[PDB]
């Protein structure tokens, strides 16, 4: 998100691609899962489109 | 030597009261 906010040009599409083979990264901690959920929700509200 | 952790620990009387509640319904 900080990188996105550092672009002075007008961005029509803001997209992120996550290359990872893991499906349960935070399996040993739930607080990190909630933090990631909140951050993803904030990015979605802002207009960032994630794959 | 120690550290900051060692020094800084982690860390019948009265009167009875009664209220009478009475229904004022028709059946009473």
């Amino acid at each position: 998100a900080n990188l996105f906010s550092d672009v002075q040009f007008k961005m029509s599409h803001k997209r992120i691609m996550l290359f990872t083979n893991e499906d349960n990264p935070h399996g040993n901690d739930s607080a990190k899962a909630s933090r990631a959920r909140t951050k993803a929700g904030d990015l979605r509200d802002t207009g960032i489109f994630l794959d | 030597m120690s550290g900051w952790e060692s020094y800084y620990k982690t860390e019948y009387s009265g009167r009875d009261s009664l209220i009478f509640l009475v229904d004022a319904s028709k059946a009473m």
Binding site: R35, D42 | S2, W4
Partner: protein
């Protein structure tokens, strides 16, 4: 090796939260005392091979009492600016609930709203010590003075990203200069030291208060008197005889014959004799600075016993006529108080110990130096008789002294009482 470098900010934040949560003042005082005792013990254990290091409780005291912070100028970021900066840095949605809550805080303080907003986002354990927080705040203040908001934003982002929600709330409160821990500044100073509030008021500074009043045992009396230094002698207060017995709680007192002499102070150290007046003027030239010079100094060098090497005394200077054995009203010296002997300082000791040690300073010798005549009285009739004797002797009046009274330079009152006919 500052202690603040080893004390995490999280510990201070937790202590403040515990103080605020506690309802009774006793619990808050206990928490603050425990924190202070831990800090002092760590400081003592760290600076073992010390050289009077200038490290004190200032790093934490300034944060605990932001309203007294004078070293750092205005940060330039108030509640509205803080809410805005939290909005940009956290990349919250401008229309999202958190953004409106931060902005619409009814210009339930802003700190609580910020804590609630940051709770799901911030970490559970910070990594910033007190020294780092103070450095960041100083950088923010300096950049605000220099009109450079980029550095302010960077420092705020660092603080936000390296602290927990509780730490963020406490930092916000410190920046706003509004803590409201439930204990007044006077209580905090009192628990810190018994003579802290008055010292802060007279000096108007915190760092000096923190450093000078570091050891609880050492009071203001010890530091108020120094060798080869001109301090302000105290003075008595006029009182009426009719209520004299009510001045000292009907306890035994000392009656001294008042002498119409100039009040001065003197320091002896080997073959060195220093003199000073009530206003700090130096008159050592009048009586000389060495036993081989002056009129009064040569005749008093032998008076002091061998056991006395370094001493400080205060008394009255007058003129004496041996021919008539009389004292001329407005060289003879009367000594009635000793403030320091050898290494130890007598300021803490009450008047009784000073009087007891006075007899061990030197052997009185009429004409040159002696001990002022005085007696012990506990009745109004004794005071009346003493006043009558003084008047018959042409003396101005009487002095009433309370043995329990302690040495408090630059203060009016206490056991020093001055009785004159009226």
């Amino acid at each position: 090796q500052t202690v603040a470098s080893h004390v995490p900010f999280a510990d201070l934040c937790s202590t403040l939260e515990r103080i605020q949560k506690s309802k009774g003042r006793a619990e808050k005082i206990r928490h603050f005392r425990e924190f202070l005792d831990s800090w002092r013990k760590f400081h003592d254990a760290l600076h073992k091979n010390h050289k009077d290091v200038t490290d004190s409780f200032y790093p934490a005291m300034r944060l605990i009492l932001p309203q007294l912070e004078r070293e750092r100028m205005a940060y330039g970021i108030k509640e509205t600016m803080l809410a805005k900066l939290y909005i940009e840095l956290l990349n919250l949605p401008r229309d999202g609930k958190d953004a409106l809550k931060l902005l619409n805080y009814r210009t339930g303080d802003f700190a609580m709203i910020a804590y609630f907003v940051l709770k799901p986002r911030c970490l559970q354990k910070g990594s910033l010590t007190i020294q780092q927080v103070n450095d960041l705040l100083d950088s923010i203040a300096s950049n605000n003075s220099a009109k450079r908001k980029d550095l302010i934003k960077k420092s705020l982002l660092q603080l936000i990203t390296q602290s927990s929600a509780l730490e963020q709330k406490w930092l916000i409160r410190m920046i706003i200069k509004d803590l409201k821990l439930g204990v007044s500044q006077q209580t905090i100073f009192s628990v810190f030291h018994n003579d802290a509030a008055e010292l802060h008021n007279v000096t108007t500074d915190l760092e000096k208060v923190c450093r000078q009043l570091h050891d609880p045992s050492v009071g203001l009396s010890d530091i108020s008197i120094t060798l080869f230094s001109a301090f302000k002698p105290m003075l008595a207060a006029i009182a009426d005889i009719e209520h004299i017995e009510k001045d000292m709680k009907h306890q035994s007192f000392y009656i001294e014959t008042k002498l119409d002499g100039e009040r001065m102070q003197m320091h002896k150290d080997g073959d060195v004799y220093k003199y000073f007046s009530r206003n700090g003027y130096n008159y050592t030239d009048q009586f000389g600075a060495s036993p081989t010079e002056g009129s009064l100094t040569p005749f008093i060098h032998n008076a002091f016993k061998a056991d006395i090497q370094i001493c400080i005394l205060d008394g009255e200077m007058m003129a004496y006529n041996p021919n008539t054995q009389t004292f001329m009203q407005k060289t003879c010296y009367c000594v009635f108080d000793v403030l320091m002997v050898n290494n130890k300082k007598l300021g803490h000791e009450t008047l009784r110990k000073r009087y007891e040690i006075l007899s061990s300073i030197f052997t009185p010798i009429p004409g040159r130096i002696e001990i002022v005549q005085k007696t012990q009285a506990h009745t109004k009739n004794e005071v009346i008789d003493a006043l009558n004797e003084a008047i018959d002797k042409r003396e101005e009046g009487i002095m009433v002294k309370q043995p329990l009274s302690i040495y408090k330079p630059d203060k009016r009152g206490e056991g020093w009482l001055k009785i004159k006919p009226e």
